[PDB]
């Protein structure tokens, strides 16, 4: 209706929404909205422009949902692959290893744990061919940037690539 | 000690009561405790290594190792006894001298031959994927430390 009207852009509406209603609820709606096959997908095509436009909300999205949801988000809308991967890259690089418990852990309390990060890459790989190659190459590149070790306890990203067998 | 070793290189019972019959076999605390060739050569190399005559030490230690392992043909030539160090603590001391020579490409043909014989023990490190419980004898952790310094 607002699209046909063309008086205000969906942006303004979704900005006001963002303040007004409960966010966890909201996001799941939006997530699922991206997937519903078309009813007149201009709808889905609008939401990706809103999201990629406003970074801050999209950071909470990837953080709030499950893994399979973001997997299907991506394979449908390739406009989401490269920035999502971008957010994982950026979370992995604020960890650190302790030797005494054999585990990657974050400094800060809110820093997506190893558990969570394993899982999402687990999924992203467990996906169709046009994304698996993309992501797997985005690992080998951030590995080499942080030293090509072939042993655990150095490169978060070596760790992961190993942990996928 | 050098002289000692060559000494130990070279080797009758009366139907009567002689003294040695009544003499005991001596202990390890005795000053009449003298080991064997191999056991001593080890002392020499050991003693040498503590002084900082690393090169010499090495050669001693290699001669040690030659003796211990290569002795298939003649009379056996034994390892050091276990108030002393075990057969892997030794190889390490071999490789450590070889490092104080600056003979690092040898020190590695040693730590290679070591972990080659002893594959068929080791901890097969699947905890590598799952990461207190599994067992690593200190010496296997260390071989890796010195491979590294090499
Ligand atoms: Zn030992």
Distance B132 CA to ligand 1 centre (A): 20
C-alpha to C-alpha distance for A1 and A8, rounded to whole angstroms: 11
DSSP A67-125: HHHHHHHHHH-GGGHHHHHHHHHHHHTT--EETTTTEE--SSTTS--HHHHHHHHHHHH
Quote the crossing angle between the two packed helices B104-117 and B87-101, to the nearest 10°.
160
User: What is the three-class DSSP state of A26?
Assistant: helix
C-alpha to C-alpha distance for A9 and A149, rounded to whole angstroms: 50
| Nearest CA distance, A149 vs chain B (angstrom) | 14
Q: How far apart are the first and last CA of chain A?
A: 49
Q: How many CB atoms lie within 10 A of CB A46?
A: 18
CB distance A152–B127 less than 8 Å?
no
Q: How many CB atoms lie within 10 A of CB B143?
A: 21
Which helix (H) or strand (E) element contains residue B47? helix B37-51
Resolution (A): 4.2
Method of determination used here: cryo-EM
Distance A122 CA to ligand 1 centre (A): 42
Nearest residue to A84 via CA among A66, A106, A59, A65: A59
- Whole-number Cα distances in Å, B17 to B12, B111, B136: 13, 54, 54
Neighbouring-strand partners of residue A104: A97
CB distance A103–B131 less than 8 Å?
yes
């Amino acid at each position: 209706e607002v699209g046909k009207a063309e008086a205000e852009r969906p942006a303004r509406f979704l900005s006001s929404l963002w303040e007004r209603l409960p966010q966890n609820n909201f996001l799941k709606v939006i997530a699922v909205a991206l997937l519903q096959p078309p009813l007149s997908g201009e709808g889905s095509q609008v939401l990706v422009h809103w999201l990629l436009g406003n970074s801050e909300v999209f950071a909470a999205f990837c953080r709030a949902l499950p893994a399979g949801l973001l997997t299907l988000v991506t394979s449908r809308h390739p406009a989401l692959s490269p920035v999502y991967l971008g957010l994982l890259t950026d979370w992995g690089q604020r960890l650190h290893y302790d030797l005494q418990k054999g585990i990657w852990v974050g400094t800060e309390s809110q820093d997506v744990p190893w558990e969570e990060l394993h899982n999402r890459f687990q999924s992203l790989c467990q996906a169709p061919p046009p994304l698996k190659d993309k992501v797997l190459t985005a690992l080998e590149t951030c590995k080499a940037q942080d030293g090509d070790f072939e042993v655990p306890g150095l490169s978060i990203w070596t760790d992961l690539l190993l942990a996928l067998r | 000690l050098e002289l000692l070793v060559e000494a130990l290189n070279v080797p009758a019972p009366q139907f009567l009561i002689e003294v040695e019959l009544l003499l005991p076999p001596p202990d390890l605390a005795s000053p009449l405790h003298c080991g064997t060739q191999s056991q001593t050569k080890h002392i020499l190399a050991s003693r040498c290594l503590q002084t900082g005559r690393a090169g010499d030490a090495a050669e001693h230690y290699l001669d040690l190792l030659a003796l211990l392992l290569d002795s298939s043909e003649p009379r056996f030539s034994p390892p050091p006894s276990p108030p002393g160090p075990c057969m892997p603590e030794v190889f390490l001391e071999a490789a450590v001298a070889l490092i104080q020579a600056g003979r690092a490409q040898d020190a590695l043909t040693l730590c290679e031959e070591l972990l080659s014989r002893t594959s068929s023990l080791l901890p097969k490190m699947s905890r590598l994927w799952e990461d207190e419980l599994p067992y690593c004898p200190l010496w296997v952790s260390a071989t890796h430390l010195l491979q590294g310094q090499a």
